């Protein structure tokens, strides 16, 4: 089992934190917030680095380019913004969604961005030009998450409409719709690091690992509280192979991926833990919490 212990608490956002993400090169943590700001923090020491500003309304998600140089953020102002982290400049403002933008990611290559919106679509954008390339009529309710697979050829999306769908990046065609025996809102999805699986959260307090190719649910993770918020979930891969997620009882849950047992619960936050991220090389977890808390915490384990 891991032994995550609290190392730093990061204060600075003035409203609920919405997402935290570690840069691929391991140097930085980025955070986004309902306060319309992105903040950068040292990944190892928690030291505040800088604030990146410009959105007109709250931000629900932020994501790093694979070279750790750029961020993309998704906002209630109905835009995404692409940022040069070093200069703090907004390179492009991506206009096209007709309602709040909720989720975003670059492809592993980092020439494309995928976004999901309250407008029920998924859009794919050219990073260099900031132009929308394709609009997929993906869902019949808000899109909660979007993620590219390992080679960028597929996109997975999830929605309040109860579906996870997998899309061909190049053609835009729907290649698969995944749903289990009940239809709760799907609140998060992402491909596994090896690209074989999809990890999906549903708003019935459940995480599931699906074999994408087979269209089969292989593992269920339960024990946490998740009925209300779109809480991120992670694969922790630096030490033991875990699944990590925030929870609506203000804890971070960690499960053994293979056995599905809870291996640790991290206590310390004073509101719902909406987002967690796992460092790419060290056994470090960042967690972020909602309006009554407003902090980010860094936890470290020996394994």
């Amino acid at each position: 089992k891991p032994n995550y212990a609290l190392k730093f608490t990061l204060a600075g956002h003035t409203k609920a934190v919405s997402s935290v993400k570690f840069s691929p090169n391991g140097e930085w943590l980025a955070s986004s917030s309902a306060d319309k700001l992105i903040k950068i923090w040292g990944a190892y020491d928690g030291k505040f680095e800088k604030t990146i500003s410009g959105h007109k309304l709250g931000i629900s998600d932020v994501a790093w380019s694979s070279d750790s140089n750029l961020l993309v953020s998704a906002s209630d102002d109905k835009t995404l913004k692409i940022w040069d982290v070093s200069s703090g400049k907004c390179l492009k403002t991506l206009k096209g969604h007709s309602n709040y933008v909720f989720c975003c990611n670059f492809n592993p290559q980092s020439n494309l961005i995928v976004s999901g919106s309250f407008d029920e679509s998924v859009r794919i954008w050219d990073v260099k030009t900031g132009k929308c390339l394709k609009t997929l009529p993906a869902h019949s309710d808000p899109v909660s998450a979007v993620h590219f697979n390992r080679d960028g050829s597929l996109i997975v999306s999830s929605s309040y409409d109860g579906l996870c769908r997998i899309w061909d990046t190049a053609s835009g065609q729907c290649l698969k719709t995944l749903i289990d025996d009940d239809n709760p809102p799907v609140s998060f999805v992402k491909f596994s690091p090896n690209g074989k699986y999809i990890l999906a959260a549903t708003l019935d307090n459940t995480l599931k690992l699906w074999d994408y190719s087979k269209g089969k649910c292989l593992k269920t993770y339960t024990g946490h509280k998740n009925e209300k918020y779109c809480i991120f979930a992670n694969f922790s891969v630096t030490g033991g192979k875990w699944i990590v997620s925030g929870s609506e009882d203000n804890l971070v849950y960690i499960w053994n991926l293979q056995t599905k047992e809870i291996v640790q619960k991290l206590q310390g936050h004073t509101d719902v833990v909406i987002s967690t991220a796992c460092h790419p090389t060290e056994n470090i977890i960042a967690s972020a919490a909602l309006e009554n808390d407003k902090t980010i915490k860094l936890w470290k384990s020996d394994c």
Binding site: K15, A16, V17, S18, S19, S33, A34, L57, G58, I59, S60, D61, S75, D76, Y100, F102, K228, Y229, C230, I274, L290, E291
Partner: peptide, 5 residues
């Protein structure tokens, strides 16, 4: 935003 609803 994600921090509501």
């Amino acid at each position: 935003a994600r921090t509501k609803q």
